[PDB]
Design a binder for this molecule. Structure first.
Ligand code: 6PL
Ligand code: 6PL
Ligand code: A1AVC
Ligand SMILES: *[C@@H]1O[C@H](CO)[C@@H](O[C@@H]2O[C@H](CO)[C@@H](O)[C@H](O)[C@H]2NC(C)=O)[C@H](O)[C@H]1NC(C)=O
Ligand SMILES: *[C@@H]1O[C@H](CO)[C@@H](O[C@@H]2O[C@H](CO)[C@@H](O)[C@H](O)[C@H]2NC(C)=O)[C@H](O)[C@H]1NC(C)=O
Ligand code: NAG
Ligand code: NAG
Ligand code: NAG
Lengths: 698, 53
């Protein structure tokens, strides 16, 4: 009766005592919305397993006999052989199907949960917010009585057919979605989001075309893309709960998720959020929808009658009987709800404890809900090793013995990579080494700067989870406003020249080798004091502010920083070889155009004859210029043909590619299951089956 | 200069290189296709495990 009770659904007196709280959290509620959400979640996970979890690509990620540097959260965990991995993914698929159909619900949830977290904890490089959300939702649905309506288990058991469920099943899910929206919103209250730096280039997508009718691009990229996301996060957190604002909230949230699905390649996350959005509606909407159909549909759709009493709810007895005393499962459910929501609120801000994982950003990516907040651009990665026996110094391929590229931004992954290299290099005639890393990275278009000290042996370095790392360089926030001026310098260049901005600590130095092609390269100092040394003649010059030097091409040079503060400078270069090739190509293009339009009546040179013929048959091999010209022309024609493609063909190719992925996954799974059960046949049969599996559908 | 893992000093020293043919790699997103086949010794191990292909 009270307005507060109507708006929030519970009275204040309900919270006076623990028993009343348990009764409130275990009141009866209709199950239909939970059943619909369970069905949709199961369907989306079933579609997601063969695409993003990597079942199609799992034959080239956990291959037996290959030497790879893993990145697990615990060093004890190691991958199983390939066949057991495919068995694990098969168990995942069966669990997802069981959840979708609600057959043996608890067993299916367990079989989906344990393998999923086993795969998730095995590799830190595949972590991301929408996988963590799937894991959490699978964990929550394991305990909820979501099989009470529109489930095969209902047909096999009368007691669990169209039955009541306690309210906390809905409460936990609503709390989870609200926490996602609110934590994402507050995390985007950062200087790099409210100012327009993060996601600066997404406003050019054609989906934002109508907004450009009334706004300029610069305002369109700030008011709509950035501020709109924050406002929608907070509002969609709040609006959906109340009845007054539910329609507008649903409309905006649906538009937001559809645009996110089209712009990005996040995967099934947008559809999962769309499936979760109706959950804030009244719990009985599928039932009234089923009621509003003809009788013929009602003979096939789920039941419309009122739900029956259950045993997993505290029933208020109005017959004069004493109220049902809450047992154990009700108290356990209430405690689970409160503790789980408190833990979910606490965990995103728990970075002050696990300081070992801290970096320029906060903690490992995945469980902070900071989506599309930081963009990074790597420039160079140098890995040096010194042999412990002879003393030779050498350089390694930066991406050796690895499958991901997130180790350039986390100290712990760097340490694991160093240990892996230490164990593996003795196979390549190298004794106990000392490894040094030098990585350059810029976040949100700042000065490119070192992230780890290049003078520290990472193999013997010190690292623990709960102490700050002593060899991670700080991020210089004092140079932030320069992002204005640098952008102006980016707009003052020609179509050929290029610029790279560098900032360096005192004491350190950068050694570089300009390639012979990059002639006409210059270095200019913006702030600080630096000294540029040429080793060809061993000559070092000290550069002051606003001075420019022309560096040699094809030689080694060094820059040392000799100021109390960090020094910022800039390389400006042009590629001479590409320019000369372009001029020659333009000259050749001009010559063919003169030949075609009737000018240049004189006989063509022999080297030009292959261009008109277009085929090398019965003649000398073409010169490199002719080959490059023909390759460019063919590439341009291929791109032009690709652009001129109708929609239906693109849709058909998309469907065929997806069907190929599904078929390959299924066939590989069957082959490996046969190998496990009936043993491994001869090599020729295995080769034949593998060849058959990879065949395109056509 | 012995095998794919080891590279010359000149190749390592070059900071000003051509990354593509556009970077701006954001997190979340997607594994974005499979370069995994470019690993060292991937072909030989694959041919051993699954026979000729
Ligand atoms: C001694 C110990 C004393 C107690 C200490 C602990 C006290 C804990 C108090 C906090 C937890 C309370 C849980 C209450 C559960 C509850 O009410 O559940 C639900 C509410 O669902 C939730 O759990 C909400 C999740 C959070 C969503 C965001 C809420 C925003 C609130 C804004 C400020 C107001 C009742 O819903 P209903 O079906 O009755 O519908 C009501 C709303 N309409 C009709 C408009 C859609
Ligand atoms: C009550 C309802 C409440 C509202 C709920 C609304 C949401 C429900 C969602 C339910 C699921 C619908 C299907 C989802 C499909 C889906 O996610 O699409 C896809 C993934 O799903 C699929 O493609 C599924 C394909 C399955 C295979 C279908 C094969 C059909 C073959 C037909 C016969 C062909 C015969 C040819 C020879 C004659 C997204 O692709 P992506 O992430 O790679 O995106 C690519 C492009 N970018 C990156 C730009 C985005
Ligand atoms: C890419 C964006 C945010 C990152 C993100 C993603 C990818 C998610 O999957 C989220 C899911 C749940 C919660 C937060 C998520 C999240 O943060 C901004 C995208 C902004 C969009 C393109 C702008 C258009 C819609 C706006 C809100 C219209 C407002 C109109 C004004 C006049 C009020
Ligand atoms: C060498 O590169 C420089 C940039 O490092 C270029 O210099 C430009 O030269 C033209 C000459 O008309 C000026 O208008 C531009 O302002 C100059 N650019 C600057 C200062 O950034 C030029 O492309 C190359 N110069 C030579 C002589 O080869
Ligand atoms: C040119 O000047 C630089 C400026 O530092 C010199 O760098 C120093 O070199 C000496 C050995 O010559 C080292 O002991 C110092 O540690 C270097 N300084 C720093 C800050 O690292 C460089 O050597 C000079 N080159 C020549 C040929 O004289
Ligand atoms: C010279 C030329 O026409 N094209 C070059 C190609 O030869 C080289 O292999 C490649 C390396 O990035 O750069 C381009
Ligand atoms: C050095 O490595 C090569 C290449 O792996 C190997 O064939 C050889 O055994 C090693 N040589 C010596 C002298 O240890
Ligand atoms: C410069 O241009 C040439 C043109 O052939 C190209 O091969 C090369 O990759 C470019 N970059 C460097 C560093 O030489």
């Amino acid at each position: 009766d009270s307005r507060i009770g109507k708006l929030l659904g519970f009275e204040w007196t309900d919270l006076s005592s623990w028993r009343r709280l348990v009764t409130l959290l275990n009141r009866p509620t209709d199950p239909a919305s939970l059943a619909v959400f369970r069905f949709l979640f199961g369907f989306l996970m079933v579609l997601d397993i063969p695409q993003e979890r990597g079942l199609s690509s799992l034959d080239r990620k956990y291959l037996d006999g290959l030497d790879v540097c893993r990145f697990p959260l615990l060093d004890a965990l190691r991958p199983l052989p390939l066949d057991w991995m495919y068995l694990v993914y098969t168990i995942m698929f069966l669990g997802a199907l069981g959840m979708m159909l609600g057959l043996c619900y608890r067993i299916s949830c367990v079989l989906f949960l344990l393998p999923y977290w086993y795969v998730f904890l095995l590799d830190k490089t595949s972590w991301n917010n929408h996988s963590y959300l799937y894991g959490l939702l699978a964990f929550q649905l394991t305990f909820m009585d979501a099989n009470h309506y529109w489930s095969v288990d209902g047909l096999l058991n009368a007691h669990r057919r169209n039955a009541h469920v306690p309210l906390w099943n809905y409460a936990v899910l609503r709390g989870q979605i609200f926490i996602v929206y609110f934590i994402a919103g507050v995390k985007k209250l950062d200087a790099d989001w409210v100012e327009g730096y993060s996601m600066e280039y997404l406003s050019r997508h054609w989906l934002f075309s109508p907004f450009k009718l009334l706004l300029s691009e610069e305002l369109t990229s700030l008011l709509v893309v950035h501020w709109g996301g924050l406002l929608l996060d907070l509002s969609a957190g709040f609006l959906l709960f109340f009845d007054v604002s539910r329609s507008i909230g649903l409309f905006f949230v649906s538009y937001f998720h559809c645009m996110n699905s089209q712009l990005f390649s996040i995967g099934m996350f947008s559809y999962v959020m769309l499936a979760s959005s109706p959950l804030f509606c009244s719990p009985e909407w599928p039932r009234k929808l089923v009621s509003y159909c003809p009788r013929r549909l009602q003979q096939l759709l789920p039941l419309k009658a009122a739900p029956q009493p259950s045993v997993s709810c505290v029933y208020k007895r109005s017959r004069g009987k004493s109220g049902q005393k809450p047992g154990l499962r009700h108290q356990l459910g209430a405690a689970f709800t409160l503790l789980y929501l408190l833990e979910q609120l606490f965990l995103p801000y728990s970075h002050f404890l696990t300081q070992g994982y801290n970096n320029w950003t906060n903690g490992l990516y995945g469980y902070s809900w900071d989506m599309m907040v930081h963009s990074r651009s790597h420039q160079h990665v140098k890995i040096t090793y010194r042999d412990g026996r002879t003393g030779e110094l050498g350089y390694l391929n930066p991406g050796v013995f690895t499958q991901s590229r997130r180790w350039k931004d986390h100290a712990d992954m760097l340490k694991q990579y160093a240990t892996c290299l230490s164990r593996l290099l003795p196979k390549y005639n190298v004794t106990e080494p000392q490894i040094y890393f030098d990585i350059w990275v810029s976040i949100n278009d700042r000065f490119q700067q070192r992230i780890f000290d290049p003078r520290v042996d990472i193999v013997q370095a010190a690292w623990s989870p709960f102490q700050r790392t002593s060899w991670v360089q700080p991020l210089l926030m004092d140079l932030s406003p320069w992002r204005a001026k640098l952008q102006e310098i980016k707009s003052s260049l020609d179509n050929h020249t290029e610029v790279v901005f560098i900032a360096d600590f005192p004491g350190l130095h950068l050694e570089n080798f300009v390639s012979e092609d990059l002639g006409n390269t210059s270095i200019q100092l913006l702030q600080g004091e630096v000294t540029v040394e040429l080793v060809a003649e061993q000559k070092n010059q000290t550069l002051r502010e606003g001075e420019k030097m022309q560096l040699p091409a094809g030689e080694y040079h060094k820059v040392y920083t000799t100021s109390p503060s960090p020094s910022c400078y800039m390389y400006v270069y042009v590629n001479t070889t590409e320019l000369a090739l372009e001029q020659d190509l333009a000259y050749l293009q001009e010559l063919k155009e003169k030949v075609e339009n009737g000018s240049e009546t004189g006989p063509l040179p022999p080297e030009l004859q292959p261009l008109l013929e277009g085929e090398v048959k019965g003649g000398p091999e073409p010169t490199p210029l002719v080959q490059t010209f023909l390759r460019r022309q063919q590439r341009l024609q291929e791109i032009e043909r690709r652009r001129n493609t109708p929609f239906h063909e693109r849709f058909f190719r998309f469907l065929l590619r997806k069907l190929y992925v599904f078929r390959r996954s299924f066939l590989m799974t069957c082959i490996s299951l046969r190998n496990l059960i009936l043993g491994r046949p001869s090599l020729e049969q295995l080769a034949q089956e593998v060849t058959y599996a990879n065949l395109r559908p056509f | 200069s012995k095998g794919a893992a080891f590279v010359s000093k000149q190749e390592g020293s070059e900071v000003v290189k051509r990354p593509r043919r556009p970077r701006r790699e954001v997190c979340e997103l997607n594994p974005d296709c499979d370069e995994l086949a470019d690993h060292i010794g991937f072909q030989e191990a694959y041919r051993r495990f699954y026979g000729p292909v």
